[PDB]
């Protein structure tokens, strides 16, 4: 329903412009700051911004893909690269948010052991392992993503081919396994660990009941926005798989199919909303704007 | 008729291999030289340094598109990346050429106002700022390369399945007058990419050389490194840019000229056979600059030690 014309391409283009500008500005803010002033959360913020930027560079290609009634003229390599960068964005962003939340748990709840942990492991090592893990986890996308003229309508569609590793019979198993693993690694387990960190933070903060509140408020706003922007996508995707497995009504399946593009759109919009969230809450980002 | 048989002997994978090698070396070296120039203090950052950074950025923007050209050459000249990337890659080649020659001209003129007349250097710095100069040259390069972006198209010429990233002059001229547009674009590109910039560079260098010979009234090999360093590195950069791009411009101009004067067929075949290698050297220049920086001007070498 609601073919919507060019709403999705227009929103993709808008997110491209605003995400590029805002993420560049936030990178300028974080790198222009002194290394002495450079806080632990700054490296995670920078990595989050880099992930968003690497996604929004490919966003114009997705806008063109949508505008052309799903025809991909950029070839196989850029199909693989764009899908891979999408999943790298998702994984690295949720991992950076997890790192920020764990840092807040270390500081607010029990800073003494936080000092020892900071002595053992530096932030740069954490960022390195985070990015290599994200790249490794998104590798299946790059290996399996391909370019094909499905339905013999002279339209090229950038789709994941599971015939490279699985036959026709086990293609459903491979697709469901990859989807469930992607959900568990990008939403479920990171949200579980972040919720545990936030729960102990909430208990210790009941005991405490502004300096900690600055960082906690901005990070919780970031995490809640990430939740509201990615929960629709994971929910619709997992629900579609469970509907295929358990034979849910076809009306609900049609509803999920028609709402999937919009959920993907909001998941993409998160990248552009991150800088305005920094501007509204973080006083340093406002300082950079004035300075 | 008699000529136009083939392109000498098959290069195999030599052109794609050199393209990939230049991609790797140019990316690494240009990134490292950008790190060197940017890590240096802004107060310490010399006037030549910002032109150096612009040169490195142009080289980087070209070498990022270089893998696509390597893939294009590997698949017997078949372009699978689309018309947008054809336009972007060709436009970035021309932006690289123009910006590099303009930065070299700016470096040469900076050395001119440094050695020939130290007095007017401050006045000319006051009149035009360095950052303003780089912004002007970059917008000039973008505008001059815009015809490349507009006129590029991907098409399945010769009725084969191959897709060639080529220049379509039909959108701006008729078939009969396509030659006029092609010759005009080529001659203008040569004039504002090699001829005029090298003319002003040679004039500045001639007066620079006369001013230095004023001190070198007698034959003295080598020079006082303290003042020599920048001039030496800029001269080697200019000489290597000449040696890497002059073959390309020379073959291009000779082919366009023989389109009228009708050179002998064998010579036209020779030019056609040699064109890919001239393009290859012109592309090598981009990665070549960092190793030159690692040999002269101990800035770059000490940066590695630090
Ligand atoms: C449309 C399709 C067929 C085009 C295929 C293009 C292929 C051959 C090209 C495009 C860009 C290339 C990559 C560009 C950059 C890198 C990173 C470098 O550290 C190793 C090589 C590697 C990984 C290249 C491998 C080959 C590559 C993937
Ligand atoms: C193969 C063909 C059909 C694809 C064409 C894609 C077109 C519509 C897309 C691809 C990338 C896009 C560009 C990406 C970035 C910028 C910079 C921005 O400041 C102005 C718009 C501009 C210049 C876009 C214009 C539209 C654009 C060129």
Numbering used by the authors:
A (entry chain A): 24 to 232, 241 to 322
B (entry chain B): 17 to 322
Task: Copy out sentences from the published article reporting this entry, exactly as the authors wrote them.
The apelin receptor (APJR) emerges as a promising drug target for cardiovascular health and muscle regeneration. The formation of the APJR homodimer occurs through a small, hydrophobic interface at the junction of transmembrane helix III (TM3) and extracellular loop 1 (ECL1), facilitated by the “FGTFF motif” (human APJR residues 97-101).
Additionally, by processing further datasets of the apelin-13-APJR-Gi complex, we isolated a distinct particle class, enabling the elucidation of the structure of the APJR dimer in its apo state without Gi-protein coupling. Moreover, the dimer interface remains largely unchanged. Molecular dynamics (MD) simulations supported this hypothesis, showing that the dimer state in apo or antagonist-bound structures is more stable than in agonist-bound and Gi-protein coupled structures, as indicated by the RMSD of the overall backbone of APJR dimers.
